Amino acid sequence: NYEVSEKAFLLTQSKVSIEQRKEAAEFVLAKIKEEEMAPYYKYLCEEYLVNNGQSDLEHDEKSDSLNEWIKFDQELYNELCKKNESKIKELNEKIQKLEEDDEGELEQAQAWINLGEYYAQIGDKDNAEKTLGKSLSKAISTGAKIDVMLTIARLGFFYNDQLYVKEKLEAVNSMIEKGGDWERRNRYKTYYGIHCLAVRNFKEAAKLLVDSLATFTSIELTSYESIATYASVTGLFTLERTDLKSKVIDSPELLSLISTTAALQSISSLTISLYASDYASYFPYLLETYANVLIPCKYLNRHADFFVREMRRKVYAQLLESYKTLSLKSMASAFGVSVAFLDNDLGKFIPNKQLNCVIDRVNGIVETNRPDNKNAQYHLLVKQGDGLLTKLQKYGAAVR
């Protein structure tokens, strides 16, 4: 499941290297052999289809597909349907015998969960769900309700999905506030920090994501680098430096995995080099991070410029500041970079509503100004009497 959806994501994102394409489905090629992945690997092969995912032995085979590995065979189905049936048949009478013998309940639910996991291996966003229902139907335990999480987490994030599972996560979480004791809370927070990481988490669960580590990861629903990676980035890109320089300044967590995946090396690291307030070095470390981090990984791509430019803003906002003063030149020039261009997007922060920057172009000079009490007193005030006016009419719609 796990690398699937990412190796999916990997090749679905393939831009940089054929490897980006190649190496992912490479496994998936072996993995659709490993598991009968076709039924979504079907639509997975229609997922990145009509980009470079255009070469399949079922869906489409196109030269403009740089990925041929998005291919099938009908044997896969034969393989599948056999495996499928085999799985099915076995569990069927098994479950049917569990039904026959009135054998256990969770034990009935047992093969159900077994029935369930296939559709993860299979890729069926299906029976497993109904199975889960008839698993959960047989659940006398939140520990089986735990499997909802497991199920739903495998559900949503086999496709890297959204809400229902999150809602299910909400649902399955809200049920027992035992939060799987300490743990499923994490699993909750994990995928919650992932659901909400679609596309956001930003300030929100990145904390939580950072908050609990290393307390879980999943294997099939996530790796440990993953959570760390993700948790770092957003939480870093978002959260309070104090926190970050309390926490991601370093954590035994980090200290453990620092450069261990090499892959990061940057996220906080070269941002700790930002957090080392270079001018340049980080400004390369950006894309040095970006393409090594954002493009590669699921949400990390789709959100994109949220980061970019926001750390790119971040570098303006707390690091370089407005700045309250100093000729833009000494910034824009004495930092050995494009005066105008840098200044432009930098100036594009003037109306971004975030700049207390006060910026001249001619004199290449920058200033600042208190933000008074504005903050968010009435500004949003409008929204709700409106949100009432919704009701207020909706009410006035009640009537008869």
């Binding site: 809400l163 596309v199 400004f283 970006y290 970019v308 430019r309 050995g336 970079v337 840098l342």
Partner: protein
């Protein structure tokens, strides 16, 4: 376009990051030229 991304403000713009690097090189390359 999909359903729920982070939405607003707005789509921003595009071709910046590499453009930046293209310039980050050039910038630094200009700073190499410096």
């Amino acid at each position: 376009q999909t359903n729920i991304w982070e939405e607003n403000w707005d789509d921003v713009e595009v071709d910046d990051d590499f453009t930046n690097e293209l310039k980050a090189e050039l910038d630094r390359y200009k700073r190499e030229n410096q």
